[PDB]
Ligand binder design. Structure first.
Ligand SMILES: CC[C@@H](C)n1ncn(-c2ccc(N3CCN(c4ccc(OC[C@H]5CO[C@](Cn6cncn6)(c6ccc(Cl)cc6Cl)O5)cc4)CC3)cc2)c1=O
Ligand code: HEM
Length: 488
């Protein structure tokens, strides 16, 4: 009867909290501590609506013992994405997840001042010039999946059925490796190095937000996975240092080697660079492999859209008389089917759905008397707004064409926007703004252009998969496959 005992107190307390006209409204739930982890972790945009139809734009909900004050729409964007440091912490929300996976010292295992420069150091491999050297590497890597991978084998076969839960994560990590990390880190993925990243993934799971370490196999296998992979990168670092092979514009390992001394002259360690390398590779590999998976599916549901984005690239190549191997970075900038498709795929399917900070001193919510106390979490969600009749009409319609017809601030890593209020914020905003956006459109952009150029495909049933949210990012439920045929 320690069933009534918690029930009666958590129940009676749930009503207690109703009183305070200074605390945002809270969603009801029957389980103590567990809260709405059910309804939210399964379909959270419905859940958001199922709360806005009741409470408007501002509200809260329990989540595995932790409070999550929400704020929808461009006003929520300003409230969380642009909070300054003395009220919200982005590390105190993302720490227990990313750190055990990437390693100490970097990303969220350091103060914000540190993180700001790591994002600056990174950006030295993310320039207009880098992207020109990456396009053909990324492309040729793709084509090498098309010819050597059992899902395609385009030099033997002419029709097939490729799983996008396999093709895209492998193509994504292979193209990221080959371009960001260079040829030896890519050649070393022949080995089931991949198995080590599989071991690292299975411990990069939302459950880390509460259970980041406990004595289980995939926990210790993740710990060991991070140790083996950093030391691999720590080995590439040492081997190109002592070789004198540090080329300040080529890879991201280079660029990180050069620039990795802080404002106060303090020096990132060899492992700290390796960990940050791990985070970068893993973060970008998830969010990019997802987006290419979806725009592969959606183009298979509306195969007309492969033909738009196809004819666009042959008009450019016919002006160059130069085949696909002569399709450059600046040519990506002139193919708006590709970019709007990616832009649309990111509207319909932003990879992160919730975005947290934790509250570090009481924070007054604007035009309310609600104050978030030290202890609760804030949650923006550019995703809700990405698929609301409020901000886009026919959010259901995968419409790449819909994309036709404030100055700046620099927190540390180059100039970003001061404006956060756009309904469309796939890459976030503020000091935690993403730095791989333009890079992602070079990847997704070459994946996409290469696929369409060689492959025409459909998806059987014209049923686009339902989305899953068990995981760190949002992915199609399998069987998520594509029925393809060589174009020639
Ligand atoms: C398991 C039981 C089941 C019933 N259930 N019950 C509840 N839930 C649930 C709850 C919460 C969540 N999540 C979803 C994921 N979410 C989340 C994911 C990523 C994230 O990322 C923010 C930061 C840290 O990681 C990166 C991701 N990234 C950004 N750009 C590219 N990747 C990041 C930033 C920088 C670097 Cl270097 C790497 C990375 Cl990974 O940004 C924040 C929140 C938290 C809530 C999912 C399911 C369930 O599945
Ligand atoms: C389509 C692909 C991507 C999407 C949709 C995406 C999304 C996001 C979002 C929403 C944030 C803000 C998180 C917050 O404010 O809480 C963010 C930040 C970030 N992203 Fe991306 N990202 C993508 C690609 C990448 C890639 C390829 C990389 C690395 C090469 C990367 C690295 C980062 C980093 C380092 C941050 C900084 C977070 C911080 O400063 O705290 N992202 N991203």
């Amino acid at each position: 009867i320690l069933l009534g005992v918690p029930f009666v107190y958590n129940l009676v307390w749930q009503y207690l909290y109703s009183l305070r006209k200074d605390r945002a409204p809270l969603v009801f739930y029957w389980i103590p501590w567990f809260g709405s982890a059910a309804s939210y972790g399964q379909q959270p945009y419905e859940f958001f609506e199922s709360c806005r139809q009741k409470y408007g734009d501002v509200f809260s909900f329990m989540l595995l013992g932790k409070i999550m004050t929400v704020y929808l729409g461009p006003k929520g964007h300003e409230f969380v994405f642009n909070a300054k440091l003395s009220d919200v912490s982005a590390e105190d929300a993302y720490k227990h997840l990313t750190t055990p996976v990437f390693g100490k010292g970097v990303i969220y295992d350091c103060p914000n001042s540190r993180l700001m420069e790591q994002k600056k150091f990174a950006k030295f491999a993310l320039t207009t010039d880098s992207f020109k050297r990456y396009v053909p590497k990324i492309r040729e890597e793709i084509l090498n999946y098309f010819v050597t991978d059992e899902s395609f084998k385009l030099k033997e076969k002419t029709h097939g059925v490729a799983n996008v839960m396999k093709t895209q994560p492998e193509i994504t990590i292979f193209t990221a490796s080959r371009s960001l990390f260079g040829d030896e880190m890519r050649r070393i993925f022949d080995r089931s190095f991949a198995q080590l990243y599989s071991d690292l993934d299975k411990g990069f799971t939302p459950i880390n937000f509460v259970f980041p370490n406990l004595p289980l196999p995939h926990y210790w296998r993740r710990d060991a996975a991070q140790k083996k992979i950093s030391a691999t990168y720590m080995k590439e670092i040492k081997s190109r240092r002592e070789r004198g092979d540090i080329d300040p514009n080529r890879d991201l390992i280079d660029s990180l080697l050069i620039h990795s001394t802080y404002k106060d002259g303090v020096k990132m360690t060899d492992q700290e660079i390796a960990n940050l390398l791990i985070g970068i590779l893993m973060g970008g590999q998830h969010t990019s492999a997802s987006t290419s998976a979806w725009f592969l599916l959606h183009l298979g549901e509306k195969p007309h859209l492969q033909d738009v984005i196809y004819q666009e690239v042959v008009e450019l190549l016919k002006e160059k008389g130069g085949d696909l191997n002569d399709l450059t970075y600046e040519d990506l900038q002139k193919l708006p089917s590709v970019n709007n498709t990616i832009k649309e795929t990111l509207r319909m399917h932003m990879p992160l759905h919730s975005i947290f900070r934790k509250v570090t001193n009481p924070l007054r919510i604007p035009e309310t008397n609600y104050i978030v106390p030290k202890g609760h979490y804030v949650l923006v969600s550019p995703g809700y707004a990405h698929t609301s009749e409020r901000y886009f009409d026919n959010p259901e319609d995968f419409d790449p064409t819909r994309w036709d017809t404030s100055d700046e601030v620099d927190y540390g890593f180059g100039k970003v926007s001061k404006g956060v209020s756009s309904p469309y914020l796939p890459f976030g905003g503020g000091r935690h703004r993403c730095i791989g956006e333009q890079f992602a459109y070079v990847q997704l952009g070459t994946i996409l252009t290469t696929f369409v150029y060689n492959l025409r495909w459909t998806i059987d049933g014209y049923k686009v998969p339902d989305p899953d949210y068990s995981s760190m990012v949002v992915l199609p439920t399998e069987p998520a496959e594509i029925i393809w045929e060589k174009r020639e």
